[PDB]
Each structure stands twice: as structure tokens, then as C-alpha cells.
Amino acid sequence: SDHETLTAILSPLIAEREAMKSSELTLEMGGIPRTFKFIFRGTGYDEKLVREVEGLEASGSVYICTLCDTTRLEASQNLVFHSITRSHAENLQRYEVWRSNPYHESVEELRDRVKGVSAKPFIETVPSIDALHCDIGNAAEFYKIFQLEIGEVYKHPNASKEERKRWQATLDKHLRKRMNLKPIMRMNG
Amino acid sequence: MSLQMVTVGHNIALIQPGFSLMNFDGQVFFFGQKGWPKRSCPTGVFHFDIKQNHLKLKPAIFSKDSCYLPPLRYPATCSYKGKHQYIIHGGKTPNNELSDKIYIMSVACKNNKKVTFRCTEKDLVGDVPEPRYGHSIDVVYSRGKSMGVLFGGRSYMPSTQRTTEKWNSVADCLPHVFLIDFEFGCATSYILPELQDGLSFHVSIARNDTVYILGGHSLASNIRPANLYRIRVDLPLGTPAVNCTVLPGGISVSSAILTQTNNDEFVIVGGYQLENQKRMVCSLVSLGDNTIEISEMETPDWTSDIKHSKIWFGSNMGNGTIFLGIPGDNKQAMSEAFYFYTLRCS
Amino acid sequence: TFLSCSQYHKMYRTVKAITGRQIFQPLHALRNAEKVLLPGYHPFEWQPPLKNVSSRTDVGIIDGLSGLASSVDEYPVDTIAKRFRYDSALVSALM
Ligand SMILES: [Zn+2]
């Protein structure tokens, strides 16, 4: 999260990475020398980092998908009909539109136009989904829905935020009584 | 001379070394946060309002038509007092690119202490200077007109000798002088033959026809020269002319802080003497009609945390008032990494 | 097995003391077989060559700051970082 030192260190590496995307490589491989080309796919960043270096805002935004461009509120109405529509150079030119402010729009309407981007893209990536944190987040969400559904709040909503801690206690105790589980919070794989 | 300590706001993280304090209409303002502008305030410029040594960094929205500017971290700033406005050129983005464009800070409307700023992106034509930081701009008048003097500072290697093992290395700009028209943003360089060696983090004063430069940090020999130079520009209706003269009775200081303590009367607070010696004793300068006099100022009090620290930074709040910041304490571990102080000059 | 050098030396000397043979190798003989396995050993040629890239093929550890000048007048830095170059580790992984 200390953005300064991270930029100032990693920028030689991204310089070299951009450099060797347009060449051949030649070296002796056991007898005859051979040649090489390259294609890179920066993928193994988690979710928070790729929200932090490609140029999006923090995690709690309204624009949520790092691939499509939809509001969080939009995903509640329409569920599954988008497509990937976020390149790297598109985020570069959108950053340019943000810094220039050509149409003299508001802060808010321009943020509505650029679809979230408010920093210079620092590095390239390919867009995709990390598997590990997908699994972990789904497990945490299902833990949440069980801690809800024991409290039977589908009939009556908005109880206190203490009985839910009680339901948390009884869920851990009962599942240790039926599956013999040690209690932890950092949800390991 | 009156020091005082000062309490801290909750979002203290936005203060870093290399900031900028602009002073609009008796009303201070902060610029140059650390890290990109967060979603809580997308501009990056903040109300630096201070009351009873407690500051409350309120945000600041822009106009409807400004150009949203990234936090430049070591810009050149000056007071174009001709409808007050400020000038920003150079600086250093958080991705350690270096822009060279100019940004002009102005006001649109002030209604009950809620202000609207207005800043404009200004492009240059002609011999554009290399994008650099640590340098110094200043404005000057002559014969009913005004122009911008710009004295160079440190920058990256050019696009040939920049190598991926020495990528972040830095060398001085070639010590030339740039003159800039802001009616159209015209540029002109001039090769002055008296100033030879590079210089950065110097201190610049402008008195309406003439520009005075002292201090500064050479890199090539890595020393701080003990001199000062007077620059006379002139604006006839023909070509503008450049002229310089060294003047004796200077000091060696590096990255200090100036302030207008009185009408044609200024004070230089301490900086660094040697590469480990922070300069403690401050100075004052009487800037006369065609004379210039530096002098020993009355040695203001320090706390032990100041005189046993190792680095400070700060800037000029505007009215005999400077704001000063040091990092935290390693042997006194409980800290939010920074502590602050304020010096008045009454 | 993540064993340090000194205990490896002790293992070496007692094995040679017990069996008379020499099955493990000594440590200088270890490093002079190690240096074939880092980055920066083997010649190669970038074609068409790379701008901003030093063309020497004898690059191992350099500092990560790229010689970022760091004194009391500049921005204060506090971090340590070591790295290779990209092509060096890439050809070493290829070989
Ligand atoms: Zn989507």
C-alpha cells in the first residue's frame, strides 16, 4: 500500500518487460543455438492489487467488476449477461480523459463517464479471476448466510447486533458437536 | 521566533515530505498528498485550516471546468499576482513519471468558507525545458509587463543513456535560464555564460524587476556553494535581455524555507549545512532597492526532539508563519511516523 | 534439506573420517558448481537489440533501487530490495 516505493522499485522491471515483447532470443541449447519469442500474461495478482495498480479505486466502490463495467446496484437486477470489456490501453486513455476533463462535466458525472478509473495505470495485466480467493470469499459468504439463517430473520428482520453474535457462537458450538471442528476466523483453505 | 507544537488530525497520512502550501486570500491550502487521491476527495487539494494548534483537513472541490491534476510532489510554485493565481510546473507524479506541463490555480466562488478552485492546464511552445523537479520558478515584472524566470533542477537521464541498471539515477539540468510568457505560454532558453555548475534546492526571491538566487546543492562535485547570484532580466518592446552578476557575502544552505516576514524583508529558516549537519541557525535578508543583505537572525528555540532528529521538511504558510515536519522516533516507538511544529515570525 | 554450510562441512568431514572414501564434496567445490546455476552465466544475443538495456551477459545480483540517489535533501527511502534482470533470469530458467 505504500505506493511510492513500490512504483520506484518495480518500474525497471516493467520497463524491461515492455522492452522484450518485440524481439527474438538466441542462445546455445546443447549443441545448436536456438531462438525464442515471448508472450506475457501478468495474472497472479490477487484482487486488491489489481484494483490498486491498474487504476481502479479501492474495493468498496460502486463499479465492482474488474472486467466489465457495471454498478454494484446493477448486478442485483441483471445477473449474468456481461462480457469482458476492460483493456489496458483503454484505461490509459480513460485516465487521459479524466485528467483533461474535456466536456467540463462535474466530478460526479465524469466519474460516471470514466467508469471508476481515477489513477494512472501503472502496469499491464491480463484480466481474469483468481481461484483461491474466489473459493475463500464464497466460503465466507456461505458462513455468513448460515449465521443468518439460524437466526430465522426471513420472517422478522433487523434484530440487534448481539443475538447474531450469539447465533455465531451456537453455530460454531453445534458444528463442533457434529463435525468436530476447531474454531478459527482467518479462513484457511 | 515563537515555536509551538501542534496536534494532528485523524487523516495525518496525507502529509508527506515534498508537499505544497498555497495561500489564497489569507486562506491556506494544502496540495501534494502521498499516494493517489482516494475516493473520499478526488481532487487532492485540501483545506489546511488550523485552529488552536488543531487542524481539520477539510476537502476542497473544484470548478465545473478545471482539469483534475495529479499530486505533484516537488513542484515549482510562485505567486503570479496579476485576480490572484498560482503557477505549478514540474513536480513528480506518484508513479515516478515526470510531467512538464503547467497548472494555474485560481478561484471561482467563495460562499461562507466553502470554496471552489479553478485550475487550468497550460502547454508550452518553443524550446520547452526538460521535465524536472527541485527547480525554481519565479515571476518578474518590467516596463508594464511580466515574465517567468525558470532556473533548472535535477532530472532523469535522457532516453539514450537511461539504462535499466541505473534507471532511477539523476543528474542536473544544464544551467540555462528559461523565460516564459503566460499570455501565450511562449518559451525561450538562454545560455548564460557566468553560472556554470548545476544547482538544485536553491532559494529564489523576486523583487519586481530582479531575481536573487542563493544556496542550492550541486551534484557534480556534490557540494553546496557559499554564494549568491543576482539576475537582471529586462523587458524592452524589442527583445528581452538576460544578465547576471555574482555577489559576495553568501552562505551554503541546501533545501531551506523562505518567508516574507515583512515588506521587502525575508527570513530563511535552517536547512542542512553538511550531508549530515542539518542547519540550525536561521538567517534574515533585507532586500533593498539594488542592494541585498543577508544577516544572522536571532537563533530561535528548539526542542530536544528537533535538535536530536536527522531530517526535517516544511513550507511557508504565508504570513510570518512556516510549518515544519519531522519523521517519527525509533527509540520512542509509539508514534504515527511523524510529528509537527509551527514557527511564527510575528 | 535447508542445511547450513557449517553442519554440512561437519557431515562431510565425519563421513570421510569414517569410511575412507570421499562421497560428499567440499564447499569450494560446491560453489564452483553452484555458479553455473544462477542467472548470469551463459552468452546470448538479443536480436533486434533492446533499448535502455545494458548488453552485458555477466549480470547476477544488483541492487533493486537501480542506484536511486538517496540523501538528506531528497525523498527518504527505507527499503532494501534485491533483484536480477529479467532477461538474465529468463535465459537461466531456459537453460
Ligand atoms: Zn462484470
Side-chain angles (χ1 to χ4, degrees), chain A residues 1-151 153-154 156-160 163-164 167-172 174-176 178-189, chain B residues 2-80 82 84-182 184-328 333-335 337-346, chain C residues 1-50 52-95:
Chain A
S1 62
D2 175 35
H3 206 81
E4 287 81 12
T5 305
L6 184 71
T7 44
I9 289 300
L10 274 192
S11 202
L13 267 164
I14 195 54
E16 292 182 33
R17 178 175 181 271
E18 185 52 42
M20 49 171 89
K21 211 183 289 184
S22 45
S23 166
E24 322 272 331
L25 201 42
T26 48
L27 85 166
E28 168 138 357
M29 183 69 54
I32 45 152
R34 297 152 172 88
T35 66
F36 284 122
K37 293 202 302 178
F38 288 99
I39 279 184
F40 292 154
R41 284 175 107 82
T43 320
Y45 313 114
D46 39 12
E47 164 60 34
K48 171 218 190 178
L49 260 293
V50 69
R51 213 171 277 277
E52 204 265 354
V53 297
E54 195 179 357
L56 299 184
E57 42 208 354
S59 183
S61 96
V62 188
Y63 317 92
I64 45 168
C65 173
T66 84
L67 274 72
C68 95
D69 38 1
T70 41
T71 88
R72 156 167 289 160
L73 201 145
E74 203 275 337
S76 301
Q77 292 96 23
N78 172 41
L79 270 301
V80 282
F81 272 115
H82 323 283
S83 157
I84 180 179
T85 167
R86 204 167 297 236
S87 96
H88 189 240
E90 182 177 359
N91 298 152
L92 287 168
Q93 77 95 39
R94 278 187 202 192
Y95 178 67
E96 186 44 63
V97 174
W98 163 263
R99 194 266 309 276
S100 70
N101 183 18
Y103 305 97
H104 321 279
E105 307 165 17
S106 74
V107 46
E108 176 261 1
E109 303 142 10
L110 185 48
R111 175 174 167 261
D112 186 88
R113 178 183 280 274
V114 307
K115 303 294 185 311
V117 46
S118 93
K120 170 168 205 53
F122 164 72
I123 204 162
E124 206 185 333
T125 175
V126 290
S128 172
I129 166 68
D130 167 78
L132 168 71
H133 307 80
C134 164
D135 302 4
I136 274 183
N138 292 322
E141 187 260 6
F142 261 80
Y143 197 82
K144 180 73 169 64
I145 201 180
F146 280 161
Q147 277 201 19
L148 188 136
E149 274 292 326
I150 178 57
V153 305
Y154 65 98
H156 58 285
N158 52 81
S160 156
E163 271 202 353
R164 320 204 200 98
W167 307 332
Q168 156 159 356
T170 195
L171 182 54
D172 179 63
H174 162 266
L175 281 181
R176 184 170 62 255
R178 298 307 297 265
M179 279 180 169
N180 283 182
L181 168 60
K182 53 187 180 70
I184 44 173
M185 266 70 66
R186 198 257 183 183
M187 298 179 69
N188 304 319
Chain B
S2 43
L3 186 157
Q4 212 159 351
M5 203 278 286
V6 52
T7 81
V8 288
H10 81 281
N11 38 4
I12 196 185
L14 287 308
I15 296 180
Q16 54 169 345
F19 59 95
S20 42
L21 274 197
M22 52 190 63
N23 189 14
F24 274 45
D25 203 76
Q27 180 70 22
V28 285
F29 283 100
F30 182 78
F31 174 57
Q33 72 152 78
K34 151 183 173 185
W36 280 84
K38 306 174 181 71
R39 189 50 200 87
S40 316
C41 168
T43 67
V45 51
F46 288 88
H47 259 274
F48 193 55
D49 315 351
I50 170 69
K51 271 199 303 173
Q52 194 52 256
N53 319 332
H54 191 64
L55 76 166
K56 194 69 65 67
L57 292 194
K58 290 172 260 303
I61 83 166
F62 280 152
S63 92
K64 204 185 168 69
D65 57 343
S66 160
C67 43
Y68 278 83
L69 72 161
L72 279 309
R73 218 190 310 173
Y74 273 98
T77 176
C78 67
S79 81
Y80 181 82
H84 200 162
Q85 66 200 33
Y86 271 10
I87 301 306
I88 291 300
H89 155 252
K92 175 172 303 165
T93 50
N95 299 321
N96 280 100
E97 308 265 327
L98 293 180
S99 165
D100 45 354
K101 319 201 293 180
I102 304 168
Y103 295 137
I104 309 179
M105 302 291 286
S106 43
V107 197
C109 164
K110 173 160 200 177
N111 41 1
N112 194 35
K113 282 83 182 173
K114 174 69 172 201
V115 301
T116 48
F117 276 58
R118 203 151 171 273
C119 74
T120 311
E121 159 186 11
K122 169 72 68 63
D123 49 345
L124 289 167
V125 281
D127 41 0
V128 288
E130 284 188 354
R132 58 178 84 90
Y133 83 107
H135 56 268
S136 69
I137 207 173
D138 217 329
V139 77
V140 75
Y141 300 94
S142 158
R143 297 201 187 183
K145 283 93 182 173
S146 196
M147 216 63 85
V149 65
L150 181 51
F151 190 71
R154 292 176 169 183
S155 154
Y156 284 150
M157 298 308 194
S159 156
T160 291
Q161 291 87 342
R162 209 177 165 157
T163 51
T164 173
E165 299 158 330
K166 292 289 203 175
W167 176 259
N168 306 103
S169 198
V170 54
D172 316 335
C173 199
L174 298 178
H176 292 62
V177 53
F178 283 80
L179 300 186
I180 305 94
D181 176 74
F182 313 99
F184 289 122
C186 320
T188 172
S189 174
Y190 296 99
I191 320 170
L192 193 127
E194 281 79 12
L195 264 301
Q196 305 172 337
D197 39 356
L199 209 59
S200 282
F201 302 153
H202 58 293
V203 176
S204 89
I205 314 171
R207 185 182 150 143
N208 74 74
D209 276 303
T210 311
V211 163
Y212 298 87
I213 289 180
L214 80 157
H217 178 101
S218 86
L219 174 88
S221 159
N222 192 24
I223 42 179
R224 308 164 176 93
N227 44 6
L228 67 102
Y229 325 105
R230 158 187 87 168
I231 319 292
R232 186 81 34 80
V233 78
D234 207 347
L235 299 174
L237 311 174
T239 178
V242 193
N243 202 0
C244 164
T245 306
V246 77
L247 285 169
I251 46 184
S252 289
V253 77
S254 61
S255 52
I257 300 162
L258 82 161
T259 185
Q260 185 177 353
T261 179
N262 212 10
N263 286 171
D264 55 58
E265 170 54 52
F266 289 78
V267 172
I268 301 307
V269 77
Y272 302 93
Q273 277 188 356
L274 307 183
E275 274 294 319
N276 49 2
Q277 262 317 114
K278 35 169 58 177
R279 177 184 162 109
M280 318 311 292
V281 167
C282 74
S283 68
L284 77 160
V285 48
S286 174
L287 174 73
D289 179 70
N290 218 1
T291 183
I292 166 171
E293 275 307 308
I294 194 53
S295 37
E296 185 269 339
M297 190 60 202
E298 201 63 40
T299 171
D301 176 35
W302 307 101
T303 194
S304 281
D305 296 334
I306 284 173
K307 63 163 53 62
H308 269 198
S309 174
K310 61 207 79 63
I311 39 178
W312 53 58
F313 54 96
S315 84
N316 184 16
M317 317 161 55
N319 39 0
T321 54
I322 61 165
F323 178 50
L324 186 134
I326 77 155
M334 67 309 295
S335 188
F338 278 103
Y339 290 121
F340 298 97
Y341 281 99
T342 318
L343 309 188
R344 320 293 184 86
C345 303
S346 316
Chain C
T1 188
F2 327 112
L3 185 62
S4 165
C5 86
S6 63
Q7 295 85 331
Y8 183 76
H9 155 74
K10 264 174 203 170
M11 167 161 86
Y12 166 75
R13 87 163 168 199
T14 184
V15 163
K16 184 174 149 200
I18 182 169
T19 190
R21 308 176 178 229
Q22 215 152 8
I23 307 112
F24 292 127
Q25 311 313 117
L27 308 176
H28 68 303
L30 192 65
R31 300 199 195 85
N32 301 355
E34 170 183 5
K35 285 188 203 316
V36 81
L37 283 171
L38 293 191
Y41 193 44
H42 307 266
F44 59 97
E45 165 190 53
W46 273 114
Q47 190 144 1
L50 301 170
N52 307 301
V53 173
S54 157
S55 157
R56 267 193 40 237
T57 77
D58 193 13
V59 278
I61 319 291
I62 70 156
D63 192 272
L65 291 159
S66 91
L68 192 137
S70 301
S71 65
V72 306
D73 311 330
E74 293 87 349
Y75 190 77
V77 302
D78 43 349
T79 63
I80 308 301
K82 298 305 187 179
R83 58 188 277 266
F84 311 138
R85 296 160 68 258
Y86 205 70
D87 70 327
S88 42
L90 205 39
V91 292
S92 205
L94 278 181
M95 278 191 61

